[PDB]
Amino acid sequence: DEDAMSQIRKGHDTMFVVLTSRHKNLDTVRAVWTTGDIKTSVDSAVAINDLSVVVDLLNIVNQKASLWKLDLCTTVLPQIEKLLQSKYESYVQTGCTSLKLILQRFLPLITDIRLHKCRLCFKQLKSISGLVKSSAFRELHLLMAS
Amino acid sequence: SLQMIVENVKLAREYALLGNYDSAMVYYQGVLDQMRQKWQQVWQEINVEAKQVKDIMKTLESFKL
């Protein structure tokens, strides 16, 4: 049938342009990532303003909590908030995964207290708390009970 | 099936767009296996998208943890 092939060809141009751009953007983030500077690497992705690149980056760093430093949380937490409001369920889950890692790794010590880093980190966590209040979000609400 | 091929191309593209590149490659590879002058063009275009997901996968794996 000719219509089904026409169905396939419609979305091709979009796919090609989207995958090429994200690949360029990923190359930029990886060129900084290979420096060893995780923070500037994530700051680079955020500056690129491409959320799909932030999701790919978070899926990577979320696998190793020992890569996270307190400084990185002040950059990530605004993205988590962005991701928690996404229409895509996979974007929301990446946000929950990252937020869990931050809560479990960093919420103590942040409580026990650079003081500005904890101060900034805490207010970011407070606005996210409000968002989670209004499943993954139920568990997160229990995790942010403070 | 004709529809099944249109089905799996949509899945490949949906997975590629959402960052599930591993799942996307599986649907991209399966569709390519199942695949008249315009039909040859369709295969070339899907083969291009497939190699692009592969190149993205190669870049993501180059992130050393």
Residue B12 has phi, psi (to 5 degrees) of -50, -50
Contact residues for B21 (Cβ-Cβ < 8 A; gap 6+): B15, B53, B56, B57, B60
**Nearest-10 crossing angle of helices A12-33, A2-10:** 30
Domain ranges of chain A: 2-143
Of B2, B9, B53, the CB nearest to A19: B53
- Concatenated DSSP letters for A52-85? HHHHHHHHHHTT-GGG--HHHHHHHHHHHHHHHT
**Tokens read off for A59:** 């899926």
**Tokens read off for A122:** 């805490």
Contact residues for A120 (Cβ-Cβ < 8 A; gap 6+): A74
**Tokens read off for A114:** 């650079």
Question: Three-state SS across A93-110?
Answer: HHHHHHHHHHHHHHHHHH
Contact residues for A2 (Cβ-Cβ < 8 A; gap 6+): B38
Size of interface A-B (CB pairs under 8 A): 73
How far is it, in rounded angstroms, from Cα B9 to Cα A15? 11
Task: Tell me if chain A has a CB within 8 Å of the CB of B11.
Answer: no
- For residue A111, give the 3-state DSSP assignment: coil
**Tokens read off for A20:** 């090429």
CB contact under 8 A, B19 and A30: no
Domains of chain B, with CATH numbers? Answer: 1-65 (1.20.58.80)
Cβ pair B28, B22 in contact under 8 A: no
Task: Tell me if chain B has a CB within 8 Å of the CB of A39.
Answer: no
Tell me the Ramachandran region of residue B63: left when phi exceeds 0, alpha when psi lies from -120 to 50, beta otherwise: beta
How far is it, in rounded angstroms, from Cα A9 to Cα A31? 34
- How many residues comprise chain A? 146
